[PDB]
Amino acid sequence: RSVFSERTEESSAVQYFQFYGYLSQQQNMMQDYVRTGTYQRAILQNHTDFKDKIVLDVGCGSGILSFFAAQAGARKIYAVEASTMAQHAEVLVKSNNLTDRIVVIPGKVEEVSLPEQVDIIISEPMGYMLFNERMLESYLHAKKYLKPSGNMFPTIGDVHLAPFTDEQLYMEQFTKANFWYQPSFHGVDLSALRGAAVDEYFRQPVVDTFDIRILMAKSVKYTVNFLEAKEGDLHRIEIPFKFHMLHSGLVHGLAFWFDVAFIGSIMTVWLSTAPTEPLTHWYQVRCLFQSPLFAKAGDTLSGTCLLIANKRQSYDISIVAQVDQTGSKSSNLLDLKNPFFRY
Amino acid sequence: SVFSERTEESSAVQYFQFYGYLSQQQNMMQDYVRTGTYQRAILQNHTDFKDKIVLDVGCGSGILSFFAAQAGARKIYAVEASTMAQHAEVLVKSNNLTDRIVVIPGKVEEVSLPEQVDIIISEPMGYMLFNERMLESYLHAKKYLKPSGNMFPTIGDVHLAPFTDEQLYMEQFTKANFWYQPSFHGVDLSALRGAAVDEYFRQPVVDTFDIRILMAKSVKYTVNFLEAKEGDLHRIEIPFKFHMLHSGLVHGLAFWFDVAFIGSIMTVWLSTAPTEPLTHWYQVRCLFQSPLFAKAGDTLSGTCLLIANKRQSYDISIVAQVDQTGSKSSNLLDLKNPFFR
Amino acid sequence: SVFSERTEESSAVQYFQFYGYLSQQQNMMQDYVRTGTYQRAILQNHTDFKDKIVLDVGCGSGILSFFAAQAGARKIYAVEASTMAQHAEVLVKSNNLTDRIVVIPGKVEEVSLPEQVDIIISEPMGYMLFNERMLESYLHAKKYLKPSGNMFPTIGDVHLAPFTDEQLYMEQFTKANFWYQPSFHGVDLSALRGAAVDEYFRQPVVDTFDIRILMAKSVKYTVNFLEAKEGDLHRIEIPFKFHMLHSGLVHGLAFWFDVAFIGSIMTVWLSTAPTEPLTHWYQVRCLFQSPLFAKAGDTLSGTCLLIANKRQSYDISIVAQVDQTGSKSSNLLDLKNPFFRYT
Amino acid sequence: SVFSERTEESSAVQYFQFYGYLSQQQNMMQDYVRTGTYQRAILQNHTDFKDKIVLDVGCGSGILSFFAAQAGARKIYAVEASTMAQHAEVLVKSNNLTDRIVVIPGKVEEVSLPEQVDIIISEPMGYMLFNERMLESYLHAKKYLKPSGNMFPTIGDVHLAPFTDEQLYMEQFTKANFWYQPSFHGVDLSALRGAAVDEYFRQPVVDTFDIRILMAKSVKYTVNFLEAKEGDLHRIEIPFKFHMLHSGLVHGLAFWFDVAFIGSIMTVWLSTAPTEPLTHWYQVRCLFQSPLFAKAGDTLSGTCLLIANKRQSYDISIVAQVDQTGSKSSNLLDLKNPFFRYT
Numbered sequence A: 001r002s003v004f005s006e007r008t009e010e011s012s013a014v015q016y017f018q019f020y021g022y023l024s025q026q027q028n029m030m031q032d033y034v035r036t037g038t039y040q041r042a043i044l045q046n047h048t049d050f051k052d053k054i055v056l057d058v059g060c061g062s063g064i065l066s067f068f069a070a071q072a073g074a075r076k077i078y079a080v081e082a083s084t085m086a087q088h089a090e091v092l093v094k095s096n097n098l099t100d101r102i103v104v105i106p107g108k109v110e111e112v113s114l115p116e117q118v119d120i121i122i123s124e125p126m127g128y129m130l131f132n133e134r135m136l137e138s139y140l141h142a143k144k145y146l147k148p149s150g151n152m153f154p155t156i157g158d159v160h161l162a163p164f165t166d167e168q169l170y171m172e173q174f175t176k177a178n179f180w181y182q183p184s185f186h187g188v189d190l191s192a193l194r195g196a197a198v199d200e201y202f203r204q205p206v207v208d209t210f211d212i213r214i215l216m217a218k219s220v221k222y223t224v225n226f227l228e229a230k231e232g233d234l235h236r237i238e239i240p241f242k243f244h245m246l247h248s249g250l251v252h253g254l255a256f257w258f259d260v261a262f263i264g265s266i267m268t269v270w271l272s273t274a275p276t277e278p279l280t281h282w283y284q285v286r287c288l289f290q291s292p293l294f295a296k297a298g299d300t301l302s303g304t305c306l307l308i309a310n311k312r313q314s315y316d317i318s319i320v321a322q323v324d325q326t327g328s329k330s331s332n333l334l335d336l337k338n339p340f341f342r343y
Numbered sequence B: 001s002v003f004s005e006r007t008e009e010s011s012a013v014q015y016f017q018f019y020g021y022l023s024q025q026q027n028m029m030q031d032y033v034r035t036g037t038y039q040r041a042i043l044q045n046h047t048d049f050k051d052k053i054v055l056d057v058g059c060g061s062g063i064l065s066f067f068a069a070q071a072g073a074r075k076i077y078a079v080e081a082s083t084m085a086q087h088a089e090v091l092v093k094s095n096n097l098t099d100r101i102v103v104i105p106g107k108v109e110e111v112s113l114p115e116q117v118d119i120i121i122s123e124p125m126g127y128m129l130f131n132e133r134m135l136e137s138y139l140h141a142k143k144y145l146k147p148s149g150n151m152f153p154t155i156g157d158v159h160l161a162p163f164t165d166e167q168l169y170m171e172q173f174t175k176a177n178f179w180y181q182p183s184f185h186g187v188d189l190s191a192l193r194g195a196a197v198d199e200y201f202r203q204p205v206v207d208t209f210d211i212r213i214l215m216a217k218s219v220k221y222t223v224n225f226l227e228a229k230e231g232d233l234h235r236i237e238i239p240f241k242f243h244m245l246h247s248g249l250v251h252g253l254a255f256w257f258d259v260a261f262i263g264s265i266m267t268v269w270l271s272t273a274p275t276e277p278l279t280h281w282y283q284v285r286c287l288f289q290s291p292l293f294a295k296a297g298d299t300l301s302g303t304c305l306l307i308a309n310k311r312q313s314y315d316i317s318i319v320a321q322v323d324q325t326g327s328k329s330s331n332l333l334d335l336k337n338p339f340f341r
Numbered sequence C, D: 001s002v003f004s005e006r007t008e009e010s011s012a013v014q015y016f017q018f019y020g021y022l023s024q025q026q027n028m029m030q031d032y033v034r035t036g037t038y039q040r041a042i043l044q045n046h047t048d049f050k051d052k053i054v055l056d057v058g059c060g061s062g063i064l065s066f067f068a069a070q071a072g073a074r075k076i077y078a079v080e081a082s083t084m085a086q087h088a089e090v091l092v093k094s095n096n097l098t099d100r101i102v103v104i105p106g107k108v109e110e111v112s113l114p115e116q117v118d119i120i121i122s123e124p125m126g127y128m129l130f131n132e133r134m135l136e137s138y139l140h141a142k143k144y145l146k147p148s149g150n151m152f153p154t155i156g157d158v159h160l161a162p163f164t165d166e167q168l169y170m171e172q173f174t175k176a177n178f179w180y181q182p183s184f185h186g187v188d189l190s191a192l193r194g195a196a197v198d199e200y201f202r203q204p205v206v207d208t209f210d211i212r213i214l215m216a217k218s219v220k221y222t223v224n225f226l227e228a229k230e231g232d233l234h235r236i237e238i239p240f241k242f243h244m245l246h247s248g249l250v251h252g253l254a255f256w257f258d259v260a261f262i263g264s265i266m267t268v269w270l271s272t273a274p275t276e277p278l279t280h281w282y283q284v285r286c287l288f289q290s291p292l293f294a295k296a297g298d299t300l301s302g303t304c305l306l307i308a309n310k311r312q313s314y315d316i317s318i319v320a321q322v323d324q325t326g327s328k329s330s331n332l333l334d335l336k337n338p339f340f341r342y343t
């Protein structure tokens, strides 16, 4: 089998590539000006990294990044795409008179064969919390086509996590779960399922944005170097943390966001999804605790955020956190595949 | 005596100690709606007092007896069980009414009066009207009432109505979920979560609210003090059938009460409804542990059962259902330990 | 099984995961019209349930089976294919009804019932009535129905009506014209504008509307669940002849549906019509690619052909013409991927 | 028993009913300073608990016994007189510590413990430290303490200090002057004005205040729980001689208290001082009937005599004089019925 199939449930792959086969979704990604513009800036301002070079675009979709590479003077670009969007990319390559420079290769990057090794790999494989969709693994897998001296755009990825307080959000989810608390819904006693319901709602990472004032400690950083990492490194991601609490209050969970860096020869360009930066279509992600932890300012909040890759192109998240001064511990399970889009 | 038989000593001690404080008397006296309405009911029905023999059940500072004196009563027996009776006597003397107000120290169930009275005055209303169980003392005092004599107040109406207030609900649920946490300073409290919910939701909420939270016109339960007997208040069964005017979550039942002084010249009402100026009685709300969903036009039916206990209060049982769907709620409350919000 | 042959693995997995969530069951349960009307239909026809054998096809949380129990059913077989079946089992135990409700995990096409039933209950309706193809499971279950048996619901009416909505129509070109720009970050996107238009118009629109946009009395197509077979729903041909009540441009066809519970005591209706309180089904509108002009009194005639596909949905083919002018329009829609427009 | 001999039954009923409420236990438990400092004192002195026999006097919810268990205690006898004992028993079971914690329902003066203990833990402090008279139970429990055994807390300090607060003083007369009107609804109430003043001044005021109202360093009275007998708390005579730091009118005495946990590893202090974060004990102020003028450098001397009564509280007798001027004032207060002024 291919590396993709061996790690991916068929149902998930079918659904996944059907999602990206729609022009409306491509439009949605393209209209994220921060993203699209920052990519174009990272590529054009490092034009020497592309000038007369061989390029691989992993998961090119409509092909916009391959066009940026073409603008930067790349002589040959292999644009790999597994969804049917590949046909639409071909249309744009012809209508933009770039048939001699951009070559669409339909299929999964783990299964196609490229005619030659490339000087640089470009891609946008970041999902929610950076790791959702497991496309970073495809990105890393594609390094089998990278020359020894090769480069990756983006080059590194930073995941930031920080504790937050937000009673409204907490109560908003708790209210949804308490439906299953009723002893007589149309005469039916549902309460025996309330535990299972709370679990289910709190299993949902919350995707949306927020005021930075809800953050109770400076973030902890976890970095993935795309030039150095291997695929298998992402099957199990262990992020330890030790927060020094800047404010007193209830910690309702952990907030996540990510930065990527295009480390080019001319300059390094950053693409950030932090809540201190303009909103992107990645927003930010929050994992709620079923029971918040009370912490005093100056306390230490320690524990681990554990990501286990599953066959549905996503991760099982286990977060365990503890207030060191009191031993108050919280353990939580989340399913990154199924988030709650709150925005 | 009837009083001691139905009352635990500990409760009685705490109860009469409470009313022995001048500050509390000041509190009741500075409720202007209450005091003014009482004075109005007595003075505008002055003929019901003119040259009459009066009994004041639980006179406290004696203010109602002074109102009776202002209206021309010939002799007023002011019975008071707390030490406040001493202070009432001081005021009787300093107001030169020794010939018209006679203070009787002791419980109305135990003291001896020299004669029968033409009219009984008292202010025995508690939270939900019935808290403190003083209405029974008031009814008990009718053994001193001449056959056609009168009662001030004459009747009392308890009003019930369903309400929606998720803020209140979640405010209490938040308090109970403290006992939900699996690691408080490392200790798992969750096994007590149920007991915590029960305790918190047993508490009637005393406070006021905007009338728009009411989802149906109130149902009325009436006690006629002229006809009622003491024993009638031992077990109070209030059936209700609400016709829902609004759709939404019913979080519980709101209670308040009116009393009427049905005098010969006019009927004067004293009201604690949320549509009227606030009194020191406020209003009382009983929460359901789980709210009931109802659409407008539905009927909410059930029973409110009040059982008198030896702690001078009531055990409250509320059973309610949305008839159209069978959605049912049952709740037990302890009027003894309310939440003053 | 009959189910597996008519359903792609990929679609079935996503489908039963969807219904495995308590929140989704809750969403259906909190539709008061839906749930209350089912309860009302069952309880007010208690003679159809008193001491009877009942089958609940796709019981979900088990709510309809509890309604059957409230009506006095002797035995209810509650069949459920998703993982919700266990939660249903929990509720049966905690409601002390284990001696009357038997939860059978699995597809109704694959499980075996120990005996024949007197009545079948189910809520198999999707958008436009037919979406999700669960009506076929409902009909398939009649192999367990006594010759005497009844179906709750008994019949289903799909209503079609022509509408005018200039804003909805123009919205499609407004969204698609994103691609009609010669230099999006230096890329000429215009060659995909046509494909983007096609994509938007293939989407049935889910939401509600003011009834004044309807330009003719609806045409009705009826399925009698007592008489129909599974195969009858593989190819559904709905001819129509609308007599225009208003003059104007016809932008497409609006769809909604009613079902009726024809019991021994009374008939109870559940309607999702735009004249009734909103339900979670809303209404569905299929646009014409080219609007048709009609004067009041003119006739709009044609056909709506629904062809079942293995993605548990239908390919919708609509052809319409104004008989007085001969001016014609078409459209092909994919009911599996509707556009949820409601806000 | 010793308890009944010193306690009126009505008061005892009221007292244990109060602590039978989960809300009251929660009130004490959510005091982070109190609870955190107990936990800290116990855990940081783990050698005082490891494999030891512990007695928890008035365990309430059992929170301190769990701390003793966290510190490695071999066996903990948790004695509790109210109905909270059953709830503590539940938590012991649900926290799997039935082999380490034994809940004993009943009064510590009445129950039978099987063996002597190495250390006694308790939180028996009331307002002004001594209110509720539970410290005597704590000391009484030493009949179960091995010689050389320890007490947590080990000592208790009550602090007294003179204060100025013109607002607080005038307030008593503002409230009592309600009665000083010749026609309240036609009634001359003035004859009760003196009695009203007396009543207000007998009430110790419970609430907090700005430390700038304090006019001299506090005088400290220390009870060593390892050395003291219960009978030592029946008549507590606190002489004082304040060296005035500020000039002005002294309106009364402010009270607060500290306890110290003197362990083998370290001493941990729990303070309810007005210089520390607020606790549920707040502080207590007792007024003089007549304020005393004092110049900075003067000495204010006298006595605070606390006399235990059968209502689980004290009659407070304060006599004070400005030594340089001979100006004298006194007050007699009823600690059982304090005025909760805090807002």
Ligand SMILES: COCn1cc(CN(CC[C@@H](N)C(=O)O)C[C@H]2O[C@@H](n3cnc4c(N)ncnc43)[C@H](O)[C@@H]2O)c(N)nc1=O
Residues within 6 Å of the ligand: A004, A017, A020, A029, A058, A059, A060, A061, A062, A063, A064, A065, A080, A081, A082, A083, A085, A107, A108, A109, A110, A123, A124, A125, A126, A127, A128, A133, A135, A138, A281
């Ligand atoms: C929705 O929110 C934004 N977003 C975007 C992306 C990236 N996108 C699209 C980017 C691309 N269209 C462009 O324009 O750069 C993924 C694209 O890559 C394709 N793809 C994925 N795994 C593949 C594989 N093994 N082999 C070949 N192609 C593969 C897939 O079909 C898409 O066309 C993401 N990872 N998470 C997100 O949340």
Ligand SMILES: COCn1cc(CN(CC[C@@H](N)C(=O)O)C[C@H]2O[C@@H](n3cnc4c(N)ncnc43)[C@H](O)[C@@H]2O)c(N)nc1=O
Residues within 6 Å of the ligand: B003, B016, B019, B028, B057, B058, B059, B060, B061, B062, B063, B064, B079, B080, B081, B082, B084, B106, B107, B108, B109, B122, B123, B124, B125, B126, B127, B132, B134, B137, B280, B281
């Ligand atoms: C929370 O709100 C306050 N509140 C106030 C009152 C009224 N007050 C004073 C009434 C009168 N002094 C006036 O001034 O109106 C009651 C007075 O009645 C006395 N009393 C009670 N049972 C007695 C008995 N068997 N024998 C003799 N005296 C008895 C008791 O000692 C008080 O002094 C009330 N009934 N319900 C309330 O809720």
Ligand SMILES: Nc1ncnc2c1ncn2[C@@H]1O[C@H](CSCC[C@H]([NH3+])C(=O)O)[C@@H](O)[C@H]1O
Residues within 6 Å of the ligand: C003, C016, C019, C020, C025, C028, C029, C057, C058, C059, C060, C061, C062, C063, C064, C079, C080, C081, C082, C084, C106, C107, C108, C109, C122, C123, C124, C134, C137
């Ligand atoms: N062929 C099938 N066999 C068994 N269950 C099915 C089948 N097709 C759909 N279902 C289930 O049928 C349910 C339809 S949703 C209706 C749920 C529930 N009866 C209620 O009235 O609230 C979903 O829970 C599906 O998982």
Ligand SMILES: Nc1ncnc2c1ncn2[C@@H]1O[C@H](CSCC[C@H]([NH3+])C(=O)O)[C@@H](O)[C@H]1O
Residues within 6 Å of the ligand: D003, D016, D019, D020, D028, D029, D057, D058, D059, D060, D061, D062, D063, D064, D079, D080, D081, D082, D084, D106, D107, D108, D109, D122, D123, D124, D134, D137
């Ligand atoms: N003589 C006594 N014997 C047993 N328990 C008592 C006695 N006097 C008071 N108590 C209880 O002691 C507790 C004091 S409150 C402290 C509770 C708990 N140890 C904590 O630290 O949170 C209350 O639960 C009282 O009921």
